[PDB]
Design a protein around this motif. Sequence first.
Motif, PDB file in Angstrom:
ATOM      1  N   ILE A  14       0.867  -1.191   0.000  1.00 32.48           N
ATOM      2  CA  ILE A  14       0.000   0.000   0.000  1.00 32.48           C
ATOM      3  C   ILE A  14       0.899   1.236   0.000  1.00 32.48           C
ATOM      4  N   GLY A  15       1.679   1.404   1.066  1.00 34.32           N
ATOM      5  CA  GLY A  15       2.573   2.544   1.197  1.00 34.32           C
ATOM      6  C   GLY A  15       3.359   2.494   2.502  1.00 34.32           C
ATOM      7  N   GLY A  17       4.108   4.886   6.145  1.00 33.37           N
ATOM      8  CA  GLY A  17       3.609   5.984   6.973  1.00 33.37           C
ATOM      9  C   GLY A  17       4.812   6.808   7.434  1.00 33.37           C
ATOM     10  N   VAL A  21       3.119  -0.525   5.134  1.00 39.59           N
ATOM     11  CA  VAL A  21       1.716  -0.946   5.182  1.00 39.59           C
ATOM     12  C   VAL A  21       1.381  -1.826   3.970  1.00 39.59           C
ATOM     13  N   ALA A  34      -5.833  -3.802   6.452  1.00 40.77           N
ATOM     14  CA  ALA A  34      -4.541  -3.174   6.246  1.00 40.77           C
ATOM     15  C   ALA A  34      -3.658  -3.589   7.421  1.00 40.77           C
ATOM     16  N   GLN A  87      -5.461  -2.855  10.845  1.00 43.35           N
ATOM     17  CA  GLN A  87      -6.415  -1.759  10.797  1.00 43.35           C
ATOM     18  C   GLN A  87      -7.426  -1.953   9.673  1.00 43.35           C
ATOM     19  N   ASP A  88      -8.476  -1.128   9.681  1.00 42.10           N
ATOM     20  CA  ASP A  88      -9.473  -1.161   8.614  1.00 42.10           C
ATOM     21  C   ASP A  88      -8.821  -0.804   7.292  1.00 42.10           C
ATOM     22  N   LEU A  89      -9.221  -1.501   6.230  1.00 43.14           N
ATOM     23  CA  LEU A  89      -8.719  -1.222   4.899  1.00 43.14           C
ATOM     24  C   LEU A  89      -9.694  -0.258   4.256  1.00 43.14           C
ATOM     25  N   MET A  90      -9.187   0.816   3.682  1.00 42.42           N
ATOM     26  CA  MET A  90     -10.002   1.815   2.981  1.00 42.42           C
ATOM     27  C   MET A  90      -9.730   1.672   1.496  1.00 42.42           C
ATOM     28  N   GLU A  91     -10.329   2.509   0.657  1.00 35.98           N
ATOM     29  CA  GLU A  91     -10.203   2.364  -0.806  1.00 35.98           C
ATOM     30  C   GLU A  91      -9.131   3.225  -1.393  1.00 35.98           C
ATOM     31  N   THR A  92      -8.859   4.390  -0.775  1.00 35.32           N
ATOM     32  CA  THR A  92      -7.852   5.288  -1.278  1.00 35.32           C
ATOM     33  C   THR A  92      -7.529   6.306  -0.190  1.00 35.32           C
ATOM     34  N   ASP A  93      -6.779   7.317  -0.553  1.00 36.31           N
ATOM     35  CA  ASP A  93      -6.482   8.395   0.378  1.00 36.31           C
ATOM     36  C   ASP A  93      -6.642   9.705  -0.375  1.00 36.31           C
ATOM     37  N   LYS A  96      -3.988  10.500  -3.227  1.00 36.70           N
ATOM     38  CA  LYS A  96      -4.231   9.776  -4.479  1.00 36.70           C
ATOM     39  C   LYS A  96      -5.479  10.305  -5.169  1.00 36.70           C
ATOM     40  N   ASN A 136      -2.588  10.929   4.790  1.00 36.09           N
ATOM     41  CA  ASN A 136      -3.031  10.381   6.057  1.00 36.09           C
ATOM     42  C   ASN A 136      -4.547  10.490   6.223  1.00 36.09           C
ATOM     43  N   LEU A 138      -7.803   8.844   4.862  1.00 31.75           N
ATOM     44  CA  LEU A 138      -8.266   7.693   4.116  1.00 31.75           C
ATOM     45  C   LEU A 138      -9.726   7.835   3.763  1.00 31.75           C
ATOM     46  N   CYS A 148      -5.441   8.699   9.793  1.00 31.09           N
ATOM     47  CA  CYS A 148      -4.532   7.630  10.160  1.00 31.09           C
ATOM     48  C   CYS A 148      -3.118   8.195  10.396  1.00 31.09           C
TER      49      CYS A 148
HETATM   50  C1  LIG Z   1      -0.033   5.982   5.803  1.00 35.65           C
HETATM   51  C2  LIG Z   1      -0.757   4.837   5.153  1.00 35.65           C
HETATM   52  C3  LIG Z   1       0.132   3.989   4.305  1.00 35.65           C
HETATM   53  O1  LIG Z   1      -1.322   4.022   6.229  1.00 35.65           O
HETATM   54  C4  LIG Z   1      -2.498   3.312   6.038  1.00 35.65           C
HETATM   55  C5  LIG Z   1      -3.026   2.775   7.215  1.00 35.65           C
HETATM   56  C6  LIG Z   1      -4.231   2.090   7.189  1.00 35.65           C
HETATM   57  C7  LIG Z   1      -4.898   1.964   5.979  1.00 35.65           C
HETATM   58  N1  LIG Z   1      -6.089   1.396   5.652  1.00 35.65           N
HETATM   59  N2  LIG Z   1      -6.363   1.514   4.317  1.00 35.65           N
HETATM   60  C8  LIG Z   1      -5.335   2.169   3.786  1.00 35.65           C
HETATM   61  C9  LIG Z   1      -5.294   2.498   2.334  1.00 35.65           C
HETATM   62  C10 LIG Z   1      -4.714   3.676   1.884  1.00 35.65           C
HETATM   63  C11 LIG Z   1      -4.652   3.902   0.524  1.00 35.65           C
HETATM   64  N3  LIG Z   1      -5.120   3.044  -0.398  1.00 35.65           N
HETATM   65  C12 LIG Z   1      -5.682   1.901   0.041  1.00 35.65           C
HETATM   66  N4  LIG Z   1      -6.111   0.999  -0.935  1.00 35.65           N
HETATM   67  C13 LIG Z   1      -6.612  -0.327  -0.551  1.00 35.65           C
HETATM   68  C14 LIG Z   1      -7.446  -0.904  -1.662  1.00 35.65           C
HETATM   69  O2  LIG Z   1      -6.677  -1.053  -2.835  1.00 35.65           O
HETATM   70  C15 LIG Z   1      -6.197   0.220  -3.263  1.00 35.65           C
HETATM   71  C16 LIG Z   1      -5.367   0.904  -2.196  1.00 35.65           C
HETATM   72  C17 LIG Z   1      -5.795   1.595   1.403  1.00 35.65           C
HETATM   73  C18 LIG Z   1      -4.366   2.483   4.786  1.00 35.65           C
HETATM   74  C19 LIG Z   1      -3.143   3.150   4.820  1.00 35.65           C
END
Ligand SMILES: CC(C)Oc1ccc2[nH]nc(-c3ccnc(N4CCOCC4)c3)c2c1
Length: 339
Positions: A14-15, A17, A21, A34, A87-93, A96, A136, A138, A148
């Motif tokens: 993902i990336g 922090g 992650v 995540a 942690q909970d997985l989100m779709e983007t930030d 992005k 940060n 999400l 986050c």
């Molecule tokens: C600083 C960042 C890397 O930390 C986090 C911590 C918890 C997170 N949950 N979901 C994310 C996250 C952040 C950005 N994109 C996605 N997605 C997940 C689904 O596929 C595309 C990317 C998920 C996340 C990032």
Amino acid sequence: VFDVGPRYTNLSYIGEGAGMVCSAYDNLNKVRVAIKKISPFEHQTYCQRTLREIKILLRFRHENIIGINDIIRAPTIEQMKDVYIVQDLMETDLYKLLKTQHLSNDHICYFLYQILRGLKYIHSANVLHRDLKPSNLLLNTTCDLKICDFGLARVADPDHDHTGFLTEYVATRWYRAPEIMLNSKGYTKSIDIWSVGCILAEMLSNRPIFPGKHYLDQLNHILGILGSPSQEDLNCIINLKARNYLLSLPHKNKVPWNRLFPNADSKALDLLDKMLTFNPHKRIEVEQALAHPYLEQYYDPSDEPIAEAPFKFDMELDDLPKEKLKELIFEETARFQPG
Ligand SMILES: CC(C)Oc1ccc2[nH]nc(-c3ccnc(N4CCOCC4)c3)c2c1
């Protein structure tokens, strides 16, 4: 190594922090999550930042703040070399999202509302985030926003906020308040409000408002738009060297927000002006920001919760050796162990 299996599998990057992650499939709850891998035990500063993040996030429960669902680490201190935070997985930030599209005012308004709602809770716990920026924040397709990355978070300490002129700072350059470069350690709530003002500006134009290329260039960018600080703000500057520096500069007039953002809502720009106020003592506080006319459609203090258990004292981790900080991290993560 990403030793989270067999329970968590099908890993994808993902990336990073402030650790690494990855996303993963949770074989128990049958959903993607995540997972942040942290390897801090060889450095005292990394141990302090890990302990603070874990202690803070385990005490917090709020819709606009990322939680900790699970913590993976070895059963004994001797064997513990990495810690994994689930942690909970989100779709983007928001970083992005801003690369791909222009946000309508009503999306900006709702995201700003959620940022401030979550920050109200953080500040009510006497905590500072200290690294708010688009990457940060999400998001999901239902437009829920979660803050986050609490790696640089601290318990507020306004009585010990003072430092010298041009003091080194850890948090992301573009989102640093002017006082960081003049007289502040970033131990007051006003540091986070400045960062939120930067994020609002960035949502309005898809460009960072103060993209400093180096430490002092950051203050150059800020003064280039805000113009020269008033006599009253220089009387609050504390440091001889900061005062002398500012007095030495040629007079610069303030750049009107409506010239930088000609298509923005006038109420958004009024709030932006109040968050990007030079003097941190005159800068709007989080509750005031929520009550501003721009957010009037969402404002509801009864639905903007505060923390049940604020951090009343300094954690006092400065003099603890990395070996003692490892014992504290081990104890703080015990609740997630099988037993
Ligand atoms: C600083 C960042 C890397 O930390 C986090 C911590 C918890 C997170 N949950 N979901 C994310 C996250 C952040 C950005 N994109 C996605 N997605 C997940 C689904 O596929 C595309 C990317 C998920 C996340 C990032």
